[PDB]
Amino acid sequence: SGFRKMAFPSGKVEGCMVQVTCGTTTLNGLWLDDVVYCPRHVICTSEDMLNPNYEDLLIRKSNHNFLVQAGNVQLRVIGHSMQNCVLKLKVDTANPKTPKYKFVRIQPGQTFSVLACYNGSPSGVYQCAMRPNFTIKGSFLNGSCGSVGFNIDYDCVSFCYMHHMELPTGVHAGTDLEGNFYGPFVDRQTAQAAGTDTTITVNVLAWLYAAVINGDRWFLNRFTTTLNDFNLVAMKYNYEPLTQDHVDILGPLSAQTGIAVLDMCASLKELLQNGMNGRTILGSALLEDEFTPFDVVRQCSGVTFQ
Amino acid sequence: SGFRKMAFPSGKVEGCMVQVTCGTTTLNGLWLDDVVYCPRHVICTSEDMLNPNYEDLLIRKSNHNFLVQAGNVQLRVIGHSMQNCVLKLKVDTANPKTPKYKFVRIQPGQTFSVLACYNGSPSGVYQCAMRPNFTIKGSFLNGSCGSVGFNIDYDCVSFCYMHHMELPTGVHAGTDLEGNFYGPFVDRQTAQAAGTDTTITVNVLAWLYAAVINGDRWFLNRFTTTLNDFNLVAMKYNYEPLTQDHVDILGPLSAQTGIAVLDMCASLKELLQNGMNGRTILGSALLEDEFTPFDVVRQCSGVTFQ
């Protein structure tokens, strides 16, 4: 037993991380088969980032202006292409450590592991959520650009995120591996509104089910509610509206615990209205929304990768 | 910027995990050079665990009664030895993936990464603390025994923990890699008192410094205090006494932020006495004690491994 915010084992991704240098700028790349993927802003100076013309900046770059190092190994760049906000550097060597992999664009509220890297070297791994407003709350210092987010299903790495920007508000923005930003963000050093964020209701309910399974049940109450009644409370507390699709995804946790999803909703309503009264749930004094229903089932059933 | 509970990259440890089977019992082992390390209770049935005579149980086992599988690879066991609560199985093949490594016995309040494994397969990685009472609050299901805790310093893995037991209270107990339990625990299915736990004061102060660096400064107050005055408050709230060694370890964070350690102590006193008044610090509604001063410096300065 016990419940922890757990990242995927990072070894399959560690083997793909490289350093990319273009003139004065160094950041991280992702070496898969004979292609290195990195943020296109590797071609910018500090001054360029105020208002970059990426097409004009990239035209002044040749294959030989991209230095790619895999630990000690120097890779030879034989092609370059810009796709949306990513650069694809064709190299003459297929990465011998390339795992089975897919590129996926995740939905708001989904979770993934980040391997934070500097100079192509991994520093640490943590689990987070794509916020409803398409930001992430990460730990990213100067040099972390090109660090990637991923999920693992047995032996297959699904890459969903590449780190590009810290907004002036201190939250983080990036792209899928086709270089399309999540949310309205652009790769320019400018004021950018993230927009109202909401709490991921279906995740909070999943984590309340994890709490019950682990013996934390003080918050289970006498009451039930309806989808429309609960959603009136969701609106007032800036929670995502609960849909029947969300109820259906919670079905397996409802079955295991014998607690109907709308009964767990009435428990959550009472917590939103009355607060936690100085108590904790799974070691937290607030309502946690960075576990998906799938996360809770995985952790609670000990599922494995390789 | 941003601050997250970050685990070490797990790839160097993933390459060392194996499945160990002795009759009916399967758990995890750690393959380093030509030695596999696992919990000695791999030789017990459910019934044995009530009151095992490990010396008598092990005498009935030969080399060929230990099945060791490294993914698809079957290893040949050519020796077995019991050291304290661990079994050392000599195998005929040195692990080709053996990283540079040390065995360390950590101090209460120190942190480490756990690679949770089932059937010799890694499922996830998380950071935790050795509690002052020598328990850990992990996520460990049936089959997780033999999962290991570790730190990494550049290219060297320091193994500090091997998982052995869940206490009836749902907290976790284990050994160093010489098989010596942390705390008073034994590898027997019996009622075992963990003893009063305390909060790791020096860690809470480190995390308050991380908060200030990241812009969370609402809790910084008008007051200072003394070591003896603060320790009177520490006693009342079940916090570890602060010593001058703890002050000295906090020196670099005091220097970076310009906040004297005793001034940060008076901030912490006010939080202990008045609570958080429904506010948060680095996304937490309680006082976090699973970051060491070294953890905060590492994360805040982007230090790297390989």
Curated annotation (Swiss-Prot), chains A, B:
Protein encoded by which gene: rep
Superkingdom classification of source: Viruses
Originating organism: Severe acute respiratory syndrome coronavirus 2
Subcellular location: Host cytoplasm; Host Golgi apparatus; Host nucleus
Protein name: 3C-like proteinase nsp5
Described function: Cleaves the C-terminus of replicase polyprotein at 11 sites. Recognizes substrates containing the core sequence [ILMVF]-Q-|-[SGACN]. Cleaves and inactivates human TRMT1, preventing tRNA guanine(26)-dimethylation of tRNAs. May cleave human NLRP1 in lung epithelial cells, thereby activating the NLRP1 inflammasome pathway. May cleave human GSDMD, triggering alternative GSDME-mediated epithelial cell death upon activation of the NLRP1 inflammasome, which may enhance the release interleukins 1B, 6, 16 and 18. Also able to bind an ADP-ribose-1''-phosphate (ADRP).
Regions of this protein lying in the Cytoplasmic compartment: 1-306
Record-annotated active site: H41 (for 3cl-pro activity), C145 (nucleophile)
Lineage: Viruses, Riboviria, Orthornavirae, Pisuviricota, Pisoniviricetes
Regulation: Inhibited by pyridone-containing alpha-ketoamides compounds 13a and 13b. In turn, alpha-ketoamide 13b (tert-butyl (1-((S)-1-(((S)-4-(benzylamino)-3,4-dioxo-1-((S)-2-oxopyrrolidin-3-yl)butan-2-yl)amino)-3-cyclopropyl-1-oxopropan-2-yl)-2-oxo-1,2-dihydropyridin-3-yl)carbamate) inhibits SARS-CoV-2 replication in human lung cells. Inhibited ex vivo by michael acceptor inhibitor N3. Inhibited ex vivo by compound 11a and 11b.
The protein's assembly and partners: 3CL-PRO exists as monomer and homodimer. Only the homodimer shows catalytic activity. Interacts with host FBXO22; this interaction promotes the proteasomal degradation of nsp5.
Domain Peptidase C30 residues, every copy: 1-306
UniProt-reported outcome of changing L205V: In strain: Zeta/P.2
Catalytic reaction annotation: TSAVLQ-|-SGFRK-NH2 and SGVTFQ-|-GKFKK the two peptides corresponding to the two self-cleavage sites of the SARS 3C-like proteinase are the two most reactive peptide substrates. The enzyme exhibits a strong preference for substrates containing Gln at P1 position and Leu at P2 position
Covalent link Glycyl lysine isopeptide (Lys-Gly) (interchain with G-Cter in ubiquitin), residues: K5, K90
